Amino acid sequence: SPGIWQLDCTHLEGKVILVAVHVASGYIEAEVIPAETGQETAYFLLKLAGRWPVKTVHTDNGSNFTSTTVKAACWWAGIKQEDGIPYNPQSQGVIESMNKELKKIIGQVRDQAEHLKTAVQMAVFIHNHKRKGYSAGERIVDIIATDIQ
Amino acid sequence: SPGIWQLDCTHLEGKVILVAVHVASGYIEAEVIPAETGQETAYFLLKLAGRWPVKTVHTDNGSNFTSTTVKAACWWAGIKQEDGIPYNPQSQGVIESMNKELKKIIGQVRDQAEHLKTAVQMAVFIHNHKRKGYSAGERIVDIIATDIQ
Ligand SMILES: C=CCN(Cc1ccccc1C(=O)NCC1CCCCC1)Cc1ccc2c(c1C(=O)O)OC[C@H](CCC(=O)O)O2
Numbered sequence: 001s002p003g004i005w006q007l008d009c010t011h012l013e014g015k016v017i018l019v020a021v022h023v024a025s026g027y028i029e030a031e032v033i034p035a036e037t038g039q040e041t042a043y044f045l046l047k048l049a050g051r052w053p054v055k056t057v058h059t060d061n062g063s064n065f066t067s068t069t070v071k072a073a074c075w076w077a078g079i080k081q082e083d084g085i086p087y088n089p090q091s092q093g094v095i096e097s098m099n100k101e102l103k104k105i106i107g108q109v110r111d112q113a114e115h116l117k118t119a120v121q122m123a124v125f126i127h128n129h130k131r132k133g134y135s136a137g138e139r140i141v142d143i144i145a146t147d148i149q
Numbered sequence: 150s151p152g153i154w155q156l157d158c159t160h161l162e163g164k165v166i167l168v169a170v171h172v173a174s175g176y177i178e179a180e181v182i183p184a185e186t187g188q189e190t191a192y193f194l195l196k197l198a199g200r201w202p203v204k205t206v207h208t209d210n211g212s213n214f215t216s217t218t219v220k221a222a223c224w225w226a227g228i229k230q231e232d233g234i235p236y237n238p239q240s241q242g243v244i245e246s247m248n249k250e251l252k253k254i255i256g257q258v259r260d261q262a263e264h265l266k267t268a269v270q271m272a273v274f275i276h277n278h279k280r281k282g283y284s285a286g287e288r289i290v291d292i293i294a295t296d297i298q
Pocket residue numbers: 111112113114115116117118119186188189190191192195218221222225
């Protein structure tokens with residue numbers, strides 16, 4: 001589970017916010033894209049996997065699961081591409097809660113930037129630093145460091 | 150030590166590659182931008198600081214040191230903005246070597262993508278995973294986890 005991530009796509013201001021969640025910690029990376037295509041998703045995974053040791057990704061929908069470009073990125077980066085079926089029903093709830101929380105934070109910062117992408121990065125920062133007492137940023141590093149050792 | 154990063158700007162294909170190096174580990178993040186501006190640099194630092202506990206940034210040149218947009222990003226993200234003067238001359242050489250290494254890797258992957266940005270992210274992945282033994286990705290996590298504990 002140190003290497004397990006979940007993709008999540010949410011919408012705001014007629015744009016798409018693509019999110020990757022490190023399941024065990026709740027740490028996130030996110031980007032704003034015009035629409036959720038295989039190429040956009042592939043490029044996002046490529047970025048993520050260069051930055052964190054991504055072993056497995058649960059894709060956010062069937063189109064990204066099927067996409068040969070997404071499969072190509074997962075092959076390139078050594079990621080096991082999996083479905084995102086919530087066999088554990090609590091999974092849906094957690095993601096939905098996170099999207100609601102992220103949108104709330106974006107609202108709280110929205111006037112501190114012209115562009116949504118800037119607001120989204122502020123929200124990523126606030127989310128990852130929030131103490132809940134460790135932060136998600138602390139938890140991910142601790143989990144991965146323990147795995148290396 | 151755990152919180153110190155250095156900015157670095159290099160050029161390829163008439164574009165600019167902006168790099169942040171975690172000094173203690175050699176771990177990097179990078180992006181392709183059309184030109185180095187204060188806004189581009191500010192946005193890059195905002196992304197970086199949401200993802201890693203960035204305490205101090207040594208800026209890459211005087212224009213980014215001076216930039217009020219860069220200063221605003223550093224204020225927002227709680228980063229101490231510093232100059233990048235190589236008081237230790239070995240610092241110049243290290244960054245020079247890294248740029249040469251990155252450009253080499255980009256050449257090795259260049260035909261595996263149409264767009265330079267894709268090649269640069271492949272290069273980030275290869276750089277961070279390269280065992281020299283531990284990888285830079287392993288070193289950064291271990292350094293930061295040790296700090297937290
Ligand atoms: C003079 C800068 C323009 N903005 C002024 C602004 C406009 C409206 C409200 C507040 C502020 C404001 O000063 N906020 C304080 C502070 C500055 C930003 C970091 C922390 C918050 C801010 C900004 C900076 C970099 C960006 C932005 C944006 C944006 O407004 O969204 O948008 C995406 C762009 C992408 C990279 C590229 O394309 O160069 O990088």
